[PDB]
């Protein structure tokens, strides 16, 4: 839940309290994360996908999803993976919408992201190393 | 036959053609990359984004139409171009032109990687990046082009491809986002460009900055930079695929963590202090402490989701991370001292932190007031903003023993007597030439690889010359030919001219003469 | 020292006058090799024209290249170094030198010297880049082997610098 | 709510907008609003194409035309510079001189190609609905089109890959753009040939759109033996980025490529009732002429007449031309044997027709390229050299 | 300054923005955000095409499907209503049922055509640079193409003008859109034929691109006598807007039009070395298939199966078909005499080739149109009727 | 350009809910009422296209027929 | 000059003063005007055309031009005619610009407006009645 918030953990502390944890010796090495981060540019299409796909059936299948308003974009962090089927977004929008149209406003991915068929997947999985990529 | 056929309407979708792409390469003994490398890229690597040329153009042109409609129709009608806070409109002179060289050189870097790869799909992944980085060059140019037309100070927005040559901050940008991209082992270049520069640092530089832009009135940069990064994520995949392609190469276990730590330090050396400086000192309204932004995007999310997850395949946490974290807290405040002290060499107008900026700095960086703030307030009292004051703070630093040195490797300035960030001065003489190095990682690079790091620094080039003559020769003046582009304040009156600089009698020293 | 302007100064005007007096491919080849041995790389003999040598070098290359097309048969332009040697023979020779290298300090010197002597227009572009790429591959493999093994104090002595200052 | 502050927009928040307005001066601080006003225009006034492209490359003054100074900050092991004059034999007083006559920066380039992308799909849905493939000679379709037109994608693909080192090594922004756009069009051509083959596989059951036989023909058929050798040489045999561009587009693709695409596959499509293939060669041929305009400007208009290096540059251009033209002539002599496998149509695939098609390709090349660089060529002698394989 | 106040923008002025924000409620006042949510979707979910198109026409309930009530506010002198059931013989339970299967509202329609507009110009600049016209048989070019292809624009132009009364009279929004888009494509076809002729006039000195001879041939050549009579009848002889649409596209253009464009001018372009004309017929043929999809939906899918009026509607459709098919067959019998003026190519312009082309046109029409309305037709009998003029 | 301003820029700005309530209500009437004007002008212009004898005048009316479809969809 | 201002003449009066002139018997018939009115939608291209073509060489050849800021559009009134050469605007903008591109943001015309070659003319002349229209 709240461990995927933008201001989770050390990000809540201020002043000397933040510095003490920032410079704590356990925090001088990276810590493996199972999370993925997805950034979506705000746009008519994206705003509909956010409310009717990500925040409904998306969070229903992945309750770890946090979505935050960053003025010009949506910041999304979740455990494991996030999936957006462009065919479903097309039905929501009432207009042709391929996975490549979806990518018009997908602004960033911290994770392994790939296009397969109508689906856009961002996943913590090491695609190509632990799980092979395929064709249609 | 000539009468029978199925007449159902069919086309050929992009992924149908992409399936046959791997078979486009054929074998001959000369088919090998032209560039020096310690690695061998596996011929079976596949790419994450199934893109063919026709669909590439369709996807990118649709991004463009919307972006250019917002800019040329909507935001222009709204007069958005002149509703930016002055400090931020000045900051975008630097951010967008400096990023422009990154976009430009990444064209060449990605073509080198396209050459390195043997797999037709991996080549295609790099090829798509080559085209994207052309797109982004033009996008960065378009931002400054737009600002030139509509913002109240076009100077510097309109001529930075030559006025950036005057100052020392440009040199460090050329290392991380120009030469670091294209001069080295293709794999080292790729970790510099894609795994670190793009997958790690373009998030703060291009995504996170848009919230700062918006906070300061700038809806031009979000419109463009957010579209830029939609291509950037496919480049992140390119960097990951590089790793994928060399994972079964025994040379990877020999070499990768060294190239990776070198690239991570290379990139962070410049971007950690410079982005922090541009974000916190180049704005009025601040979003969050830069060290918090760094923590979220660099340390926890990039480090955990990219580096930490790759530990299964022999990728180590960067040895230089501990030193990078100290830079995240303090190095941008260190750089601000250099940037404000040497303002006449820039091409943007700066503003000292006002009283409420200063309270913000102290609250989020306890100890900032007693160190940096006292210095800024003293400089203000001495006439920092006042053109008739005869006061340029670089000479104040020299008068008080606070010499500025340029790292031979990173080109980043260093004031050891004031710096709270990582580093210490090392001065070596070698073959009749002195060299100032500033940190353990850069010194090792120069010691092992002196012939990669012969960059002339601004003191070497300008030694003995008077400030105003260097600025005049560099065309760092407005269209009247007398008024500086750069300014120490963001007001519309009392601008410094060449005569105002010359009255300060500031001549460039050789910082290494005392040694 | 007090520097002259960046792009137009007496140092460059002086060297362009010397470059103008070159009249044969033989004379220009030795001139460019002498200049590059004298003023380029960290093992250069002189840092006196540090801020000017790269532009002067460009001006020497232009002269030698034009003399090449004026004075040498076409087949020569593709297959021979201006020293008279066979380009492919130059290639084979210097790759063999670098793979015979014992240390990174031997290998680094061979590569730098190869570029000092045979940089275009002395060697044909295609032969040069192919060789420089092969030399670079070997130099990296040696240098990047146990990159963090030797401590800085050690590396400083191995390099041979005079340590003028180390901050405490 | 959410964990972090929801940032107020300076453009629309009343407080911040009022603050920003109090800080914006009531007058402009300079009147020069033309972005990079100092670029020398090639045409009457500065174009946006020049404004967004020119001097993006941060060359120092020791690379002809550069505005910057000093050495690169980081170079290769051994000292190879990021960019350097050692990259090519050719010389010029200014590497920024080149101008694409079609003035393509990124947006117009993808805008145009996106029209072709979408329209092509619309054309393919209608053609499948027309059943127009019914009138295609099955032998041309299954034997010349599927096998020998399919094998030509490998020539286009090799030409595309020849640009990889060009894109890294070449020495200015407008040149890089010209090169990269030419490379994408070439890989577009190869993908479009595979797209046509995949289309026919949907309309003709048992039609094998796999690249196996095309790849086998490309690599072991004597009809493509000489073409494959040239492309492998142009791609991987050299790194002078001017040599690659000149050899690839101005010699090989302008002689072998133009004959194969336009005189064989397009021209003979309109003798054997092929209403589909000319839709695709219309694109490749359009790409070839757009690319030719920029190649012409770079090599013919500029480098061959550079005030200080023109004659110098023509020496290399003339040398390159003699070698690669000799390779392309061999490639065409191998290729005209394909005419032994097609129905003899007078003035088309008889000796008279192939002779006059070669007279078109070599004659046009003389007017487009050879005459303007001072390269002396006997067209007739080259025609009879190629027909030697007829 | 200026004479009138410079208005402050409520979006960005601090004062007015603060005032507006104080008036905007903190919650939505309804949750139904789907524009015209009550439209019955034809597909899985509502499409934008339906949302922006459906029920724009303000029909009252006494025109099948209308949601409004009452008489029109102003009618013709004598009482003819703005729209009325007296406009057509056909009947339906809902005039809004029709759906263009390509879902074209205005934006996608001009977006697609704009791609063709710009690409066509790019293709023409390259073709002129290729000199590809050199391989065009001069007789086909100057005698069949200039004169007889040019005269066909008049058929397209008449079909276009047949839609004028359709655009005024027809009874729903999606139908109107379908009709108007079909009309523009037809006048596009005529302008594109004239564009091709004007292009050739630029490449061939002495080539007369004037419409004088084409117009003379259209109006007095017996080869077009029957085509001109049908088009003049379809255009100005009737006003039932369903009759015009059905007769124009589903009978005349689907038989005479398809044979003339695809079996003659396009097909014989790829026997006489014409690499230019198929670029233009690619567009007309694409337009024909897009138009056919919407015509099919309106007449075949809907009106012929309307739950209450299908058999009623097929009675008129079958009657219209017998008359206009008989006219189109006569038009084709006049037209095949053109084959006396072209070189006899086996399986193409001999009796066997023309016979099998007609078997394509009439066979496809049987499958596309006749079988689905219950119209019984002997294909063979129609082929021999047309060849009677060969 | 129009759809870029609307679907990209103004949406990102949240412009749709920054209208004074009275005016956002007024646009319910103005744009839908104007919509019928746009729609019927399609039919009117086709009638005028029919009335004219000059091919150019027909063309002038024909362009309006298409424009009024555009405007229906715009409203 | 000021007779072409938006608020010229009766438009300056308020209250009873405006009504008295509005209902003056001489103002119950139309009065012939030699003016033309041109409305240009604000856009990057248009704003450059306004300042560098209309307000410089435009007002130099026709000093009767008044240009007023109407927030979303430019209101332009002039005596006789206004001409805008799209070829000149193209050189100003540095990009291809036909007369049809100019028309993208030409929003309204009170007057006789027509396209000839690269030129867009709005004129008080009764085109087609007093002066015939031509081809290129
Ligand atoms: Fe980029
Ligand atoms: Fe990138
Ligand atoms: Fe309208």
DSSP B338-379: HHHHTGGGSSSB-----HHHHHHHHHHSTTHIIIIIHHHHHH
Q: Scan for tokens 């007739």, then name that residue.
A: D380
Secondary structure letter of residue G131 according to DSSP: B
What's the length of chain A?
136
Tell me the residues surrounding ligand 2 (ion) with CB < 5 Å.
B 198, 235
By C-alpha distance, which of B484, B411, B491, B387 is closest to B159? B484
Nearest residue in C to D62, CA atom: C55
Cα end-to-end span (Å), chain F = 16
Report how far residue G118's alpha carbon sits from residue E114's, in angstroms, rounded to the nearest whole number.
Answer: 20
Which of B456, B458, B435 minimizes the C-alpha distance to B447? B435
CA distances, B178 to each of B96, B97, B108 (Å): 14, 13, 9
Q: Which of B461, B484, B457 is CA-nearest to residue B472?
A: B484
What percent helix, strand, coil does chain E show, rounded to 5? 65, 0, 35
Specify the resolution in Å. 2.0
Q: What is the least distance, in Å, from the CA of G62 to any CA of chain B?
A: 26
Q: Identify the DSSP state of A127.
A: B
Please report residues of B whose CB lies closer than 8 A to that of A115.
48-50
- Spacing, Cα F41 to ligand 3 middle (Å): 7
Chains that touch C (3 or more CB pairs under 8 A): B, D
CA-based R_g, chain E, Å = 25
Return the DSSP state at B493.
Answer: S
Please check whether residue G1 is in contact with residue G64, taking contact to mean a CB–CB distance below 8 angstroms: yes
Please, are residues B506 and B392 in contact by the beta-carbon 8 Å criterion?
yes
Method by which the coordinates were obtained: X-ray
Q: Say if the Cβ atoms of D267 and E135 lie within 8 Å.
A: yes
Cα(E62)–Cα(E71) distance, integer angstroms = 9
Token pair in block for residue B219: 């809806």
Give kind and range of the element (H or E) at residue G41: strand G35-41
CA B197/CA B133 separation, integer angstroms = 14
CA A66 to each of CA A5, A121, B24, D5, E86: distance values in angstroms, whole numbers, following the listed order:
6, 17, 43, 15, 61
Give the Cα separation of C143 and C104 in Å (integer).
6
Q: Is D385 helix (H, G, I), strand (E, B) or coil?
A: helix
Cα distance between residue E208 and residue D31, in whole Å: 54
Strand partners, G110: G37
3-class secondary-structure state, position B500: helix
| Among D288, D286, D266, D268, residue whose Cα is nearest residue D278 | D266
Please name which of E211, E2, D293 lies closest in space to residue G67, comparing C-alpha atoms: E2
Q: How far apart are the first and last CA of chain G?
A: 35
CB E187 within 8 A of CB E156: yes
Cβ–Cβ under 8 Å, residues D27 and B92: no
Q: What are phi and psi of B122, to 5 degrees?
A: -65, -45
**Cβ–Cβ contacts within 10 Å for residue F21, how many?**
12
Provide the phi-psi class of B41: left if phi over 0, else alpha when psi is between -120 and 50, else beta.
Answer: beta
Q: Which residue has 């005030």 as its token pair?
A: D307
Q: Which ligand is nearest to the CA of B235?
A: 2
Please answer yes or no on whether A92 and E50 come within 8 Å at the CB atom.
no
CA atoms within 13 A on the CB side of A30: 27
Residues 6+ apart with CB under 8 A from E15: D14, E8
By Cβ distance, the residue of C7, C55, C111 closest to D78 is C111
Instruction: Compute the distance between CA of residue D215 and CA of residue D206 in angstroms, rounded to an integer.
Output: 19
Q: Identify whether the C-beta of residue B263 lies closer than 8 Å to the C-beta of residue B180.
A: yes
Task: Measure the CA dihedral D148/D150/D151/D157, to 10°.
Answer: 150
How much distance in Å is there from the Cα of D259 to the middle of ligand 1? 39
CA–CA distance, E291 with B360 (Å, rounded to integer): 66
Spatial contact of C49 and D62, defined as CB atoms under 8 Å apart: no
> B residues 260-299 near D, CB within 8 Å?
266, 284-285, 287-288
| C and G adjacent (3 or more CB pairs under 8 angstroms) | no
The helices-and-strands tally (H runs, E runs) of chain C is: 8, 1
* Cα–Cα distance measured from residue E255 to residue E250, given in angstroms and rounded to the nearest whole number: 8
Structure tokens at C107: 């290998």
Number of alpha helices (DSSP H) and beta strands (DSSP E) in chain E: 17, 0
| Alpha carbon separation from E365 to B272, D50, E260, E334 (Å, rounded) | 71, 55, 14, 20
CB B498 within 8 A of CB B506: no
Closest CA to B365 of B348, B377, B353: B353
Which residues contact residue D333 at a Cβ distance below 8 angstroms, ignoring those fewer than 6 apart? D226, D385, D386, D388, D389
Q: Which of D271, D80, D106 is nearest to D173 (CA)?
A: D106
Entry field: residues in chain D: 390
Query: Touching check for D77 and chain F: CB below 8 Å?
Result: no
| Residue B232, annotated as binding a ligand | yes
- Interface of F to A at Cβ within 8 Å reads 6-8, 11-12
Dist. CA B103 → ligand 1 center (Å)? 5
**How many domains would you assign to chain G?**
1
The full DSSP string for D80-128 is --SS-GGG-S---S-TT----TT---HHHHHHHHHHHHHHHHHHHHHHH
Rounded Cα distance between D175 and B107, Å, is 12
Q: Which two tokens stand for residue E276?
A: 């230019």
Residue of F nearest to A42 (CA): F12
DSSP character at residue G7: T
Known catalytic residue at B140: yes
**Structural contact between residues B315 and B260, judged by C-beta atoms closer than 8 angstroms:** yes
CA E180 to chain centre: 8
Tokens of E82: 């703005």
Closest CA to D300 of D375, D242, D373: D373
Residue range(s) defining the domain that contains residue G67 = 1-136
- CA atoms E214, E220, E221, E227: torsion sign: positive
Q: Angle formed by the axes of helices E277-295 and D277-295, to 10°?
A: 130
Give the span between the Cα atoms of D25 and B89, in whole angstroms. 12
Contact B427, C136 (CB under 8 A): no
* C131 token code pair: 């060789």
CB of D89 within 8 A of CB of C125? Answer: yes
Kindly report the number of other CB atoms within 10 A of residue F41's CB atom.
Answer: 18
Copy the structure tokens of residue D287. 């790409």
- Based on the number of CB atoms within 10 Å of its own CB, is B313 exposed (0-12), middle (13-18) or buried (19 or more)? middle
CB contact at 8 A, B71 and G44: yes
Residue A78 belongs to what H/E stretch? strand A73-79
In sequence order, what are the beta bridge partners of G31? none
Task: State the burial class of residue B38 (Cβ atoms within 10 Å of its Cβ: 0-12, 13-18, 19+).
Answer: buried
Q: CB of G51 within 8 Å of any CB in chain E?
A: no
Contact call for residues D301 and D361 (beta carbons, < 8 A): no
Q: Which residue has the tokens 């009066």?
A: G13
The CA dihedral of C108, C114, C115, C119, to the nearest 10 degrees, is: -170
Contact B21, B120 (CB under 8 A): yes
What lies within 8 Å, CB to CB, of E386 at 6+ separation is E329, E332, E333, E336, E358
Residue F29 CA, distance from chain mean position? 14
Give the Cα separation of D285 and E125 in Å (integer): 11
The DSSP code sequence of E249-284 is: IIIIIIIIIHIIIIIIIIHHHTTTT-SSHHHHHHHH
CA C132 to chain CA centroid, Å, is: 11
Counting runs of H as helices and runs of E as strands, what totals does chain G give? 5, 7
DSSP A116: E
Q: What whole-number distance in Å separates Cα of residue C107 and Cα of residue C96?
A: 11
Q: In what order do the strands lie in the sheet with A73-79?
A: A66-69, A73-79, A35-41, A106-110
Distance CA B374, CA B361 (A): 12
Whether residues F8 and A72 touch (CB distance < 8 A) is answered with no
Give how far Cα E152 sits from Cα of C150, E161, E221, Å.
Answer: 86, 14, 12
State the ligand closest to the CA atom of E106.
3
Spell out the domain ranges in chain B.
1-515
Q: What is the DSSP letter of D374?
A: T
Report yes or no: C54 and D71 within 8 Å, Cβ to Cβ. Answer: yes
> Which of G48, G94, G95, G101 is best to mutate for the D interface (most D CBs within 10 A)?
G94
The neighbourhood of ligand 1, an ion, using CB within 5 A, equals B 103, 133, 136
In angstroms, how far is the first alpha carbon of chain C from the final one?
Answer: 30
Q: Which residues pair with A74 in a beta bridge?
A: A40, A69
Helix (H) or strand (E) holding C106, with range, is helix C104-118
Residue B133 to residues B123, B137, D95, Cα–Cα distance (Å)? 15, 6, 20
Helix (H, G, I), strand (E, B) or coil at G113: strand
Is the bond leading into F41 cis (omega within 30 degrees of zero)?
no
Helix H or strand E segment including D281: helix D277-295
Are B158 and D35 a contacting pair, CB within 8 Å?
yes
For residue G48, give both structure tokens.
Answer: 């450059």
Beta-strand pair B413-414/B405-406: antiparallel
Place of tokens 């009392």: B494
Residue B227 CB partners (closer than 8 Å, separation 6+): A41, A107, B63, B64, B66, B67, B139
Tell the burial category of B40 from Cβ atoms under 10 Å away from its Cβ (0-12, 13-18, 19+). Answer: middle
* Neighbour-count burial for B11-25, b at 16+ CB within 10 Å, e otherwise: bbbbbbbbebbbbbb
CB B466 within 8 A of CB B506: yes
Contact criterion met (CB below 8 Å) for B415 and B403? yes
Bridge partners, residue C166, by sequence: B426
How far apart (Å, rounded) are the C-alpha atoms in residues B215 and B140?
20
Interface list for F 14-43 with E (CB within 8 A): 15, 17-21, 35-36, 39-40, 42-43
User: Is B91 in contact with B11 (CB distance < 8 Å)?
Assistant: no
Give the count of beta carbons closer than 10 Å to the beta carbon of residue D237: 17
Residues B15, A136 contacting (CB under 8 angstroms): yes
User: Among B134, B132, B156, which residue's Cα sits nearest to residue B144?
Assistant: B156
CB atoms within 10 A of CB E5: 10
Three-class SS state of B211: helix
Distance E283 CA to ligand 3 centre (A): 29
**CB-based contacts of C48, cutoff 8 Å, min separation 6:** none
- Across the beta sheet with G66-69, what order do the strands follow? G66-69, G73-79, G35-41, G106-110
Chain A interface includes E101 (CB < 8 A): no
First-residue to last-residue Cα distance in chain B: 91
Residue B390 · residue B506 · CB < 8 Å: no
Element (H, E) at A106: strand A106-110
């Amino acid at each position: 839940s709240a461990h995927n918030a933008y201001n989770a953990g050390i990000m809540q502390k201020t002043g000397k309290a933040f510095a003490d944890e920032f410079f704590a010796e356990e925090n001088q090495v990276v810590h493996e994360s199972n999370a993925v981060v997805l950034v979506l540019m705000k746009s008519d299409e994206i705003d509909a996908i956010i409310e009717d796909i990500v925040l409904k059936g998306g969070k229903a299948k992945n309750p770890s999803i946090v979505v935050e308003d960053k003025a010009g974009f949506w910041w999304i962090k979740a455990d494991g993976a996030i999936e957006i089927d462009a065919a479903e977004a097309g039905e929501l929008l009432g207009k042709p919408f391929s996975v490549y149209d979806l990518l018009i406003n997908v602004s960033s991915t911290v994770g392994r992201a790939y296009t397969l068929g109508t689906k856009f997947t961002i996943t913590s999985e090491l695609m190509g190393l632990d799980r092979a990529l395929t064709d249609i | 036959d000539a009468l029978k056929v199925n007449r159902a309407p069919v086309g050929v979708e992009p992924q149908e053609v992409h399936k046959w792409l791997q078979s486009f390469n054929w074998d001959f003994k000369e088919n090998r990359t032209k560039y020096p490398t310690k690695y061998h890229m596996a011929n079976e690597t596949k790419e994450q984004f199934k893109v063919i040329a026709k669909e590439y153009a369709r996807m990118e042109a649709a991004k463009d139409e919307r972006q250019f409609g917002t800019l040329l129709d909507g935001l222009t009608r709204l007069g958005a171009g002149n509703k930016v806070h002055p400090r931020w409109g000045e900051t975008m002179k630097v951010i967008s032109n400096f990023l422009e060289v990154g976009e430009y050189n990444a064209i060449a870097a990605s073509a080198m990687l396209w050459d390195s790869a043997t797999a037709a799909e991996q080549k295609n992944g790099y090829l798509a990046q080559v085209l994207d980085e052309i797109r982004h060059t033009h996008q960065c140019a378009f931002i400054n082009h737009y600002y030139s037309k509509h913002y109240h100070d076009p100077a510097g927005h309109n001529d930075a491809r030559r006025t950036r040559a005057i100052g020392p901050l440009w040199k460090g940008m050329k290392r991380v986002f120009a030469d670091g991209f294209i001069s080295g082992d293709a794999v080292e270049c790729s970790v510099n460009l894609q795994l670190v520069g793009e997958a790690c640092f373009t998030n703060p530089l291009i995504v996170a900055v848009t919230e700062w832009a918006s906070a300061n009135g700038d809806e031009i940069t979000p419109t463009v930079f957010l579209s830029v990064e939609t291509d950037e994520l496919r480049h992140m995949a390119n960097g990951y695929q590089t790793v994928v392609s060399i994972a079964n190469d025994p040379a990877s276990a020999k070499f990768l963590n060294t190239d990776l730590n070198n690239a991570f330090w290379t990139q962070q050396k410049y971007f950690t202090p410079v982005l922090g400086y541009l974000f916190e000192y180049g704005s009025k309204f601040k979003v969050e402490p830069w060290v918090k932004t760094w923590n979220r995007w660099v340390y926890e999310d990039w480090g955990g989701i990219w580096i930490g997850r790759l530990g299964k395949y022999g990728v180590e946490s960067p040895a230089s991370l501990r030193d990078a974290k100290r830079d995240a807290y303090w190095a941008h405040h260190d750089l601000a001292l250099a940037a404000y002290a040497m303002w006449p060499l820039g091409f943007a107008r700066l503003a000292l932190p006002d009283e409420e900026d200063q309270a913000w700095f102290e609250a989020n960086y306890p100890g900032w007031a007693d160190h940096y703030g006292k210095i800024f307030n003293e400089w203000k009292k001495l006439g920092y903003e006042d053109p008739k004051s005869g006061f340029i703070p670089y000479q104040w630093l020299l008068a008080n023993g606070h010499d500025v040195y340029i790292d031979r490797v990173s080109q980043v300035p260093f004031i050891p007597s004031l710096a709270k960030g990582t580093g210490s001065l090392r001065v070596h003489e070698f073959n009749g030439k002195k060299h100032s190095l500033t940190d353990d990682w850069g010194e090792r690079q120069w010691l092992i690889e002196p012939e990669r790091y012969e960059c002339h620094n601004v003191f070497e080039q300008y030694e003995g010359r008077e400030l105003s003559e260097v600025i005049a020769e560099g065309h760092g003046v407005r269209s009247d030919g007398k008024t500086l582009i750069a300014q120490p304040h963001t007001r519309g009156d009392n601008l410094w001219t060449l005569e105002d600089i010359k009255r300060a009698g500031c001549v460039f020293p050789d910082p290494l003469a005392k040694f | 020292a007090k520097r002259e302007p960046i792009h137009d100064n007496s140092i460059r005007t002086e060297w362009e006058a010397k470059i103008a007096k070159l009249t044969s491919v033989d004379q220009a080849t030795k001139f460019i090799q002498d200049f590059r041995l004298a003023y380029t790389s960290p093992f250069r003999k002189s840092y006196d024209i540090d801020v000017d040598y790269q532009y002067i070098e460009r001006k020497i290359e232009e002269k030698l290249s034009v003399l090449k097309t004026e004075k040498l048969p076409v087949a020569d332009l593709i297959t021979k170094a201006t020293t008279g040697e066979d380009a492919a023979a130059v290639e084979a020779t210097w790759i063999a030198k670098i793979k015979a290298a014992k240390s990174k300090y031997e290998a680094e010197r061979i590569h730098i010297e190869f570029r000092q002597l045979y940089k275009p227009p002395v060697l044909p572009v295609n032969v040069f880049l192919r060789t420089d790429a092969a030399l670079g591959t070997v130099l990296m493999e040696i240098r990047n082997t146990d990159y963090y093994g030797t401590p800085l104090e050690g590396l400083r002595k191995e390099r041979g610098v005079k340590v003028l200052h180390l901050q405490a | 709510p959410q964990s972090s502050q929801v940032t107020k927009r300076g453009l629309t928040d009343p407080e911040r907008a009022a603050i920003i307005a109090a800080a914006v001066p009531d007058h402009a601080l300079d009147t020069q609003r033309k972005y990079h006003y100092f670029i020398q225009p090639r045409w009457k006034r500065l174009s946006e194409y020049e404004q967004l492209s020119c001097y993006a490359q941060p060359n120092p003054d020791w690379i002809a035309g550069g505005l910057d100074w000093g050495d690169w900050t980081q170079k290769f092991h051994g000292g190879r510079p990021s960019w350097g004059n050692e990259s090519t034999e050719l010389r010029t007083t200014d590497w920024y001189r080149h101008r694409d006559p079609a003035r393509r920066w990124h947006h117009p380039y993808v805008k145009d190609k996106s029209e072709e992308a979408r329209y092509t799909q619309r054309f393919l849905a209608a053609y499948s609905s027309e059943g127009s493939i019914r009138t295609i000679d099955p032998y041309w379709r299954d034997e010349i089109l599927n096998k020998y037109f399919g094998a030509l994608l490998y020539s286009e693909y090799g030409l595309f890959n020849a640009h990889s080192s060009v894109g890294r090594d070449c020495l200015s922004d407008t040149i890089r753009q010209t090169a990269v756009f030419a490379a994408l069009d070439k890989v577009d051509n190869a993908q479009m040939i595979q797209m046509e083959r995949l289309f026919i596989a949907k309309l003709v059951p048992g039609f094998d759109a796999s690249t196996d036989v095309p790849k086998k023909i490309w690599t072991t058929d004597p009809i493509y033996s000489g073409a494959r050798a040239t492309v492998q040489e142009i791609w991987q045999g050299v790194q002078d980025w001017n040599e690659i561009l000149w050899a690839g587009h101005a010699v090989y693709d302008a002689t072998f490529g133009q004959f194969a695409r336009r005189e064989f596959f397009q021209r003979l499509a309109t003798v054997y009732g092929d209403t589909l293939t000319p839709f695709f060669t219309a694109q490749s041929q359009t790409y070839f002429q757009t690319t030719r305009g920029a190649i012409d400007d770079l090599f013919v208009y500029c480098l061959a007449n550079d005030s200080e290096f023109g004659a110098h540059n023509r020496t290399f251009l003339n040398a390159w031309t003699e070698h690669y033209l000799a390779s392309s002539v061999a490639a065409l002599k191998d290729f005209v044997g394909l005419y032994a496998k097609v129905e003899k149509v007078a003035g088309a695939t008889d000796r008279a027709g192939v002779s006059e098609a070669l007279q078109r390709v070599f004659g046009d090349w003389k007017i487009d390229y050879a005459d303007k660089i001072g390269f002396r060529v006997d067209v007739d002698q080259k025609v009879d050299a190629v027909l030697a394989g007829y």
